[PDB]
């Protein structure tokens, strides 16, 4: 039995999941979400507040287990500074043929790591985009083959070295166990997509708090990664501005009553407190949905630029359109009727992403969070890119 603690560090919530694996079998042992403190705009802005928020989650998880289990950690975070980088590493053995070994592959991959580091970048995910043996044949796994020459093109999802170091050092400090750091957006895609979507082409739109993350898959791997710098935080701010209420009351209103489609709504009255925390004010669910709307149309319209960019890259491989359409994830994916709005914008199939609707293995007792789009990355963290 191996145990994993997966943590997905968002700028509004930190989510955690403890899993156990035996043979082919997985079970969920604990899960929770806490308020995030000290992160903003993809950066730790208050390390002491960050540490305490993380600690608060670990304490919940341990109360659920009732046992002080050892596990290995996998921890993901979001950032607008994720980028895709391509690196080629070549080994020429001259005249003789030799067996390609785990040693040779491990060394070539170390080399690609150093080449990205020399360029001030650290990969959170690295995989091979192509193996080429003797300048003439493409293989998918070169292990035990014979070649005089091997070239490997790696695709990496990287962040700046200094971003990596800050997270690594604070986390090591807090988590007192071996850990690996990952991209929340890559792990979201791994937690929610099916294998035929990842192979034939699909776009994940992550409706997060500080910004909307965008990632596209083809041939089983990420082919493009980007963002729109407008997220649920701006929707919250719009409501707080029109109603004159606190950030917290505006988010409560959105989560409680928000709808992405307003044009058929009744004028149901809803109540909230003004900034003095005391006066009761009144609006309608329709009116709240009118605010929400404009900003969500904005986010989906700017994400459509990325969708069309991908659609061009995918059509070059002989696909018609992006066959998988759009999968919506993150907190904003829980707004009622968001898929209806996204379908009007994208003119494409749109579904909600969650671990339950991927084709990943059933996890015993995981249902409550397997069905939650904001837990996708927490699951995806325990799986790797093809
Ligand atoms: N049921 C809900 N209905 C509507 N909105 C919700 C719901 N639950 C959460 N949200 C919204 O989603 C925002 C949080 O989104 P999440 O994706 O969980 O944030 P995050 O994971 O902390 O963000 P990232 O990944 O750092 S940019 C919240 O502020 C709410 O506005
Ligand atoms: Mg997130």
From TrEMBL:
Entries under Pfam families matching the protein: FtsA, SHS2_FTSA
Molecular function terms, GO-annotated: ATP binding; identical protein binding
Protein localization: Cell inner membrane
Any one Gene Ontology BP term: FtsZ-dependent cytokinesis
Domain called SHS2: residue spans: 4-192
Annotated GO CC locations: cell division site; cytoplasmic side of plasma membrane
Keyword vocabulary terms for this entry: ATP-binding, Cell cycle, Cell division, Cell inner membrane, Cell membrane, Membrane, Nucleotide-binding
Membrane topology recorded in Swiss-Prot or TrEMBL: Peripheral membrane protein
UniProt binding sites for ATP: 11-13, 15, 78, 209, 251, 331
Function text: Cell division protein that is involved in the assembly of the Z ring. May serve as a membrane anchor for the Z ring.
Family: Belongs to the FtsA/MreB family.
Subunit structure: Self-interacts. Interacts with FtsZ.
Protein name per UniProt: Cell division protein FtsA
